[PDB]
Scaffold this active site. Sequence first.
Site, PDB file in Angstrom:
ATOM      1  CB  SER A  61      -0.916   0.018   1.222  1.00 36.65           C
ATOM      2  OG  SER A  61      -1.707  -1.158   1.204  1.00 36.65           O
TER       3      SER A  61
ATOM      4  CE1 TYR B 221       7.403 -12.023 -14.709  1.00 38.95           C
ATOM      5  CE2 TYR B 221       9.679 -11.930 -13.977  1.00 38.95           C
ATOM      6  CZ  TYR B 221       8.752 -11.963 -14.991  1.00 38.95           C
ATOM      7  OH  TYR B 221       9.176 -11.942 -16.307  1.00 38.95           O
TER       8      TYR B 221
ATOM      9  CE1 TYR C 218      -0.028  -9.605   2.188  1.00 38.64           C
ATOM     10  CE2 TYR C 218       1.619  -8.041   1.424  1.00 38.64           C
ATOM     11  CZ  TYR C 218       0.313  -8.475   1.464  1.00 38.64           C
ATOM     12  OH  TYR C 218      -0.683  -7.801   0.784  1.00 38.64           O
TER      13      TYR C 218
ATOM     14  NE  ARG D 281      -1.824  -6.403  -4.043  1.00 39.78           N
ATOM     15  CZ  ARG D 281      -1.865  -5.206  -4.621  1.00 39.78           C
ATOM     16  NH1 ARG D 281      -0.991  -4.887  -5.573  1.00 39.78           N
ATOM     17  NH2 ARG D 281      -2.784  -4.329  -4.244  1.00 39.78           N
TER      18      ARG D 281
ATOM     19  CE  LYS E 222      -1.316  -7.418   4.538  1.00 32.11           C
ATOM     20  NZ  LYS E 222      -0.624  -6.170   3.952  1.00 32.11           N
TER      21      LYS E 222
ATOM     22  CB  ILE F 179      -1.712  -6.007   8.161  1.00 32.60           C
ATOM     23  CG1 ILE F 179      -1.022  -6.485   9.451  1.00 32.60           C
ATOM     24  CG2 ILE F 179      -0.849  -5.038   7.387  1.00 32.60           C
ATOM     25  CD1 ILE F 179       0.141  -7.453   9.260  1.00 32.60           C
TER      26      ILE F 179
END
Lengths: 293, 293, 293, 293
Positions: free
Chosen positions: B47, B109, B135, B140, B163, B205
């Site tokens: 973010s 990726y 995380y 993503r 997270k 979070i």
Amino acid sequence: GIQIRGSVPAIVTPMLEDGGLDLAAFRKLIDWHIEEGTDALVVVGTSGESATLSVDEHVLMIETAVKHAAKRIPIVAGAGGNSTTEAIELSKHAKAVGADATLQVVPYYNKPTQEGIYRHFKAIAEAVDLPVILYNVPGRTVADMSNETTLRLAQVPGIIGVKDATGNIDRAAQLIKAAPAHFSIYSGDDPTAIALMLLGGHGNISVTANVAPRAMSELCRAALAADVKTAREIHMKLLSLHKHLFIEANPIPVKWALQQMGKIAGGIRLPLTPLDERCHETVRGALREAGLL
Amino acid sequence: GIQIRGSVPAIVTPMLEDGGLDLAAFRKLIDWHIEEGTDALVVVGTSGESATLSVDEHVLMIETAVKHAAKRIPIVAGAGGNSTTEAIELSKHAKAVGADATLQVVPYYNKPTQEGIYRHFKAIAEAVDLPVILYNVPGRTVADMSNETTLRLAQVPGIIGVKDATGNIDRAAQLIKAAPAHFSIYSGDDPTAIALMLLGGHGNISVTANVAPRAMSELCRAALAADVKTAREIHMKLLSLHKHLFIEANPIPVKWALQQMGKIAGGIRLPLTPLDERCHETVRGALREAGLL
Amino acid sequence: GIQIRGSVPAIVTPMLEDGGLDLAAFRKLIDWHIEEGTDALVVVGTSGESATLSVDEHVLMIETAVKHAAKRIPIVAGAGGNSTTEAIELSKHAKAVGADATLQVVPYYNKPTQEGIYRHFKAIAEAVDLPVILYNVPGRTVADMSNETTLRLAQVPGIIGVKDATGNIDRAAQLIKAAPAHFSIYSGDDPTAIALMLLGGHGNISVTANVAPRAMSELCRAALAADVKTAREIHMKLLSLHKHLFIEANPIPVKWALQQMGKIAGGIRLPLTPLDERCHETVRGALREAGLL
Amino acid sequence: GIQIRGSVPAIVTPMLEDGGLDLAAFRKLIDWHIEEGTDALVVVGTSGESATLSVDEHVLMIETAVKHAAKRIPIVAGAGGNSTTEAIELSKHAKAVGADATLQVVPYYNKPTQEGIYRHFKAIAEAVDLPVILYNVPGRTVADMSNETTLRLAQVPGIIGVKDATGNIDRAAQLIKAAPAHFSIYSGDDPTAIALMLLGGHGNISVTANVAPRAMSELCRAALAADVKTAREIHMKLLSLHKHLFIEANPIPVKWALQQMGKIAGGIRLPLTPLDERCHETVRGALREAGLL
């Protein structure tokens, strides 16, 4: 203009067992590709572990390839990323050491909009006077550059093609049909590349061609000449290779394959890992069946 | 050890019109968060546009947050990526300017194996003596750290939690049930965080907490105290915000929202783009409805 | 009107070795459910193999359940499908043998539009004067009834609720917040049902409750009374069962489980098959761990 | 043996405005297909609305086609479903009214295992002495018959081919390479059928050929003769049709298309609906561009 067409291996980055660059092996690999019929090379793309190289190592790999190739074939440098300013800076380096073009991936991870993807590529093309080949691989980036966005970028000076890794043959026909004459459609998906080329695309930027450069060059040559029988006979022979070189994430299997073939050492950089032991016999059988081992 | 619990905004990185950092607005935001009840901050996470900051800007943001917070709340530094050596260097920098922990994303990726992910995070924890919060956000990264891999890393000294942005509430309960006592499970999915906390997780979070820090601090406080009725009444009021803050990829909408609230300027770095004009009415409507505007 | 609330097993259809109905075992199962605290039953739903029963067998199962229950608990008859006229005929038959409501699945396989789904369910409610509970399970139907379509159907006389098998807890909260007072939201996803009920839903139409009806009745009772601690302690004990009852497609595992518990014989109709021998150890282990064996 | 090869429309079921069968229109359509070059017909498959026909109407449609075709071309009857006993009974009817083969879909909705899929098809093939063409369309059934299961069924007497609707050209090459000589691979995906046929498959069971039977027959003829240039020129001309005939779920658009062409009335049965008004101009433009309007 630079004319990139046919079989274009996305060549691995050979490493010593400790992960350091192995330029001696890399030079020998380049000579081997040229004598086997490879048409161009993409250097330090995804298959070349661009994620885990420093900027100095990235540029050294491009320069090494350019110097050793000695203009015998075109050298395309992977130079993209998910930061527009970083992609511009890497593209400047690629130009400075004599690359013939950059390959520019759609931004991974941060999920730009279609307009953000357009502006990203447009800013790269404008900032560095060197040809750009776009690269759409949503299976790795999540973001997916639509055909409409791709064709908008075909109108931007400097942007000369797209590597389409979707394996979506409907989408490839749509791009081939609508693309301007100057704009090349390359496969990024070895299992379907033959179809993309038979439908009117221009080449295959390839994993399999790392280990079978001559076969892949013959397959591309035939597919681009609309010779289905010759192309499909080669393709069917390589079918197990096209599959098992992704038994784990590329380039984990193809680097283990080239090590078995005696062409590179075992180095590969975290978070990538040497091919799982449990996969070895499957990849070995595919190589022996292809006559490579 | 450091206690990170409750409402933890993934705070935006304020920028001026050209994308340059806006540290004065950032310090004011930190003070507002503390006044409103925020429990800790994740700085230069997703973010915070970590993808488009230089290393020096990344470190300056962490240092600014640590200094301005003045130990009133913990500061967790985003410091991960898809290169193990780069994540180690960023983690070194975060520790050196006083971060209390790092937030470490699964590599995006390059699609590491589960053992690659294990080795990546273990190397990071071992290299820098500072706590790590893992995380996982496969929406993503594509790569998905399995619960089995997560629970193995919970045995590594220094790895204090995860997270989980999947929104998969079955997976959350599985982690909560099996996690060792020292290992915290945080939500990374504002729409489902209430459920993760009510099942025994430890915090959220959060994107929404950027604009409603008081409400989200009260939601987390209630959910962690097993007070369903209070937590769900707050959650339902924020339900449209949880949705429309993702009408385009985070942090595009929440940066536009904070600008409408007068708290930051409009800077955002390509390939991200200012919130599409077609979305403005919808997002502002959610803000106004939630009493933020 | 009829009150359907709490724990509602989607009860299996007991069969003998050739697949023939086993009504004697079925009646004993119904009595056991009532003794153990089950609140209502869905008969010849998906878990009841509606796909492989004749219309006469379908109706006989409903009639047997209505007669044997003797008004002690409500009986909801599965009566939907992908043909509007066929669903109307089955609903007529269900009303005629005393069902209290029908459970109506979104059409599978032929992929109607949202307006097609709206018109399908509206026609069914209007044609037969008996309450309807909608059933959205896109993991089986492909077609996905949007929340907008569901809330439109909540305005149709006779449509009293929806079984939401998505496990999408954001979508559940959205339905709960917007649903009119007469319209119940039930879980169709045992792993997430606790969260749907704690957010304000009304019950769980359940696979796990086939084998643990007492525990699931107590879980629903607690979750509907906002007692997180009691509900989550039961949920965590059943967590492995929620998973391994889907190790193969429901109802393959739960029919094998009930046979191991001595409650039914092994009949199951092609294309479904007896639980694969390779899964037996895992499923029995979950049963034994949950104190059912 | 029956030899099914080339362009095989999955022909719609013409209906009067009130949904009743329109056999007069159906007979005229059959004559039109034969004069335009259609090679065979699949009657009352998915495109023929098998979900919403009674058994009497289903069998009447097959008989009508068989009688009117008068052995000029082969007639393949859709006769499958997710109940093994129902598929056996429908296959007996198809044989009794003189169908040349049945098309048998993988069970939808109830999600059988691979072994359940094998036993389902094997029981159908053994129960009725008439050829079986398998049909894999996971985009509608959820269950996905693996290549390995498909090739096991290729060894069962009576099972003569498979309609593969995945559009997955890698999977098609794998099936073509491994299939026994007696076993035909048909496309079920108009946008990719040209590639499946160029790689060595045997035909295309088609939606687009409902409105362009002559063009599709020429495309199949050329693709099967390894004539890329001729096939791809036709394919590119039909590209917008291949796309927009799925603007809503097949057969909603193709029935509206044929109504605009004057070949059928507007009837279509719930839960399917007449093509949305908002889509009309898009489909109309595709038909006018194809020269059909």
